[PDB]
């Protein structure tokens, strides 16, 4: 399941990608935050062939953060740009990716106990937990993470969630194992 309520990124966000293949017209990439849907990164700058484009392909083991240049929700395309990300902008992306991944990892163990098999079932769990904090605090990503850390000291944060006693214990357990 994706990390956030919305199914597509907003124009101008910088997102992290995995480089999947090299073709004539660019690199196909997977958005790590959006359930691995496929995007693209336009040709970085100037001009280039495919022969030495593999020296530009070290991102496959680097997972660069790139900015969304165009979206078309109807057609399904996401175009991205590497060239416009500054090093200072990049530092936040590494931090954001680690933070958002942490919420996922907490919830992924949650997903195992109830044995979800369909993405929409997993999303609804998210809708009632991680995404409640994201919406309540109008801070995508950061909201869920900050609240989970607090649960060590403030257990009451799960009380307003629609959960039974059993559901609560396994969620609480996985925080302690951190």
């Amino acid at each position: 399941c994706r990390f956030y309520q919305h199914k597509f990124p907003e124009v101008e966000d910088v997102v992290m990608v995995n480089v999947r293949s090299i073709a004539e017209m660019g690199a196909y990439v997977s958005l790590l935050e959006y359930n691995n849907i496929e995007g693209m990164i336009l040709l970085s700058e100037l001009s280039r062939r495919r022969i030495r484009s593999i020296n530009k392909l070290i991102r496959i083991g680097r997972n660069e953060c790139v900015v969304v240049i165009r979206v078309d929700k109807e057609k399904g395309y996401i175009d991205l740009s590497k060239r416009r990300v500054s090093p200072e902008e990049a530092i936040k992306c590494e931090d954001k990716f680690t933070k958002s991944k942490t919420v996922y990892s907490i919830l992924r163990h949650v997903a195992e106990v109830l044995e979800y098999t369909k993405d929409e079932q997993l999303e609804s769990l998210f809708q009632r937990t991680a995404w409640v904090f994201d919406d309540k605090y109008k801070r995508p990503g950061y909201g869920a993470y900050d609240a989970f850390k607090h649960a060590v000291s403030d257990p009451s944060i799960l009380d307003s969630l629609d959960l039974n006693e059993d559901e609560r214990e396994v969620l609480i357990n996985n925080i302690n194992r951190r």
Binding site: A23, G26, R70, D79
Partner: protein, 59 residues
């Protein structure tokens, strides 16, 4: 350093409109559809052969 400076400002109209072209955003939106045929071809063709094309209306 013989620069004849031309600090030439807008004298036509929408200066930023006639520089950034839709072609790089229409050829890119072509390949990602051009590649969809090949992935489809490896799933769509086995129903488009003369031996099987006569199978359907038989049953």
């Amino acid at each position: 350093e013989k620069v004849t400076v031309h600090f030439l400002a807008v004298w036509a109209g929408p200066a930023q409109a006639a520089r950034q072209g839709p072609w790089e955003q229409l050829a890119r939106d072509r390949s990602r559809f051009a590649r969809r045929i090949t992935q489809a071809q490896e799933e769509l063709s086995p129903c488009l052969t003369p031996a099987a094309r006569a199978r359907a209306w038989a049953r």
